[PDB]
Amino acid sequence: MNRKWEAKLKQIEERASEEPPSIWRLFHRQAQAFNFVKSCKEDVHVFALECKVGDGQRIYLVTTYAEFWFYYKSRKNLLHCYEVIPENAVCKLYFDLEFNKPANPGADGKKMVALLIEYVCKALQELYGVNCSAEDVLNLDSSTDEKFSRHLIFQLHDVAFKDNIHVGNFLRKILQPALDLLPDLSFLVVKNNMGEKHLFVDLGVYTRNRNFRLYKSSKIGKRVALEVTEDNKFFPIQSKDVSDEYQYFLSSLVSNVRFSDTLRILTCEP
DNA sequence: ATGCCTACCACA
DNA sequence: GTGGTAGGC
Ligand SMILES: Nc1ncnc2c1ncn2[C@H]1C[C@H](O)[C@@H](COP(=O)(O)OP(=O)(O)OP(=O)(O)O)O1
Ligand SMILES: [Ca+2]
């Protein structure tokens, strides 16, 4: 309720101011886009598009995964797109990983990713009995000369988290040995620009309706798009009916939890 | 016409 | 300890 009231209170504050089957609908307000989704029989999802302005202004788009990919895959249009991870929606385990390269000259980013996956896979086994390995982790890279940047999206067989807030509670729980510095989790500690210690794992992405940059999109002011990392070990099952790139796209979507008649939903309370 | 929220510091 | 905020995702 405390979270539902504050959101609805922004709606009252904002209130102060034949053909082929297709569902391409744009909205200025995120709440309007979700109101349309609930009022829509098809399986549509909310995307966020960065506006040309240098700020973080966003315009929200509702459509199906398939139609979005159709108009998105050429990378000629819809640059700088984000997935809106809906609050209270089941979601995959995912990570935002970063550190300043000049400020961490000794750090081996590739090694840190493998160690993190190893530890997270142990925690999933000890706390939930879930078995997985690096072969289940989609590894996306957006690194620059200055920044080591990865997105990991776990592809767990018939398993998902209740919502992305629970993902955050799970990570805060198992990374507590590392947060205390700010099990031996010293490898996660990195320096920011100002020499202030931080964790390699960005915990700020587990918030309600978090935007999460799409596979093959870049930030508005930049040119580096998220692409599959060379050391990626998750390979989707190939199908004669869909392209491999579409399969990677669907795997990369945090909110695109594979339908299963034996799905287990993992919760983690604060 | 973006949304979210913790870390941080000043006050009983 | 809470406010109470603005700085960062
Ligand atoms: N100003 C914002 N408004 C809304 N959502 C945001 C904003 N900044 C970041 N986000 C969301 C989208 C990002 O994909 C996600 C993580 O932030 P961040 O690490 O800065 O970007 P990123 O991981 O997409 O690129 P990179 O780290 O390579 O610069 O949080
Ligand atoms: Ca990042």
Residue numbers in the entry: 1 to 17, 36 to 200, 261 to 348
Question: Can you list sentences taken from the study reporting this PDB entry?
Answer:
PrimPol is a human DNA polymerase-primase that localizes to mitochondria and nucleus and bypasses the major oxidative lesion 7,8-dihydro-8-oxoguanine (oxoG) via translesion synthesis, in mostly error-free manner. PrimPol is important for both nuclear and mtDNA replication and belongs to the archaeo-eukaryotic primase-polymerase family that differs from other DNA polymerases by possessing a primase activity. The PrimPol catalytic core clasps the template-primer by two α/β modules, ModN and ModC. ModN (residues 35−105) interacts primarily with the template DNA strand and the template oxoG base, whereas ModC (residues 108−200 and 261−348) carries the catalytic residues Asp114, Asp116, and Glu280 and interacts with the incoming dCTP nucleotide: functions normally associated with the finger and palm domains of DNA polymerases, respectively.
The 2.1 Å resolution structure of PrimPol, extending a correct primer C opposite the oxoG, depicts the next step in accurate bypass of this oxidative lesion. The structure of the extension complex is almost identical to the unmodified complex (rmsd of ~0.46 Å over 249 Cαs of molecule A, for example). To capture the extension step we used a 17 nt DNA template (5′-CAT(oxoG)CCTACCACACCCC–3′), where the oxoG lesion is moved one base downstream compared to its location in the insertion complex, and 13 nt DNA primers with either a C or an A 2′-deoxy-3′-terminal bases (5′-GGGTGTGGTAGGX-3′, where X is C or A), and the next correct incoming base dATP. Thus, the T3 template base, which is 5′-adjacent to the oxoG residue, is now paired with the incoming dATP. The oxoG(anti) at the extension position of the active site is in a Watson−Crick base pair configuration with the 2′-deoxy-3′-C14 terminal primer base. Surprisingly, the conformation of the phosphate group of the oxoG is similar to that of the phosphate of an unmodified residue at the same position of the PrimPol complex (the C template strand residue in the undamaged complex). The steric clash of the O8 atom with the sugar-phosphate backbone that arises with oxoG(anti) is alleviated by adjustments of the backbone torsion angles of the phosphate group and a slight rotation of the sugar ring compared to the values observed for B-DNA. Thus, the conformation of the sugar-phosphate backbone of the template base at the extension position of the PrimPol active site is preset to accommodate the oxoG(anti). Overall, the oxoG(anti) template strand residue is accommodated at the extension position without significant adjustments to the active site or to the position of its partner primer terminal C residue, compared to the unmodified structure. This correlates with the near-normal efficiency extension from oxoG•C pair by PrimPol (∼75−85% of that observed for undamaged DNA).
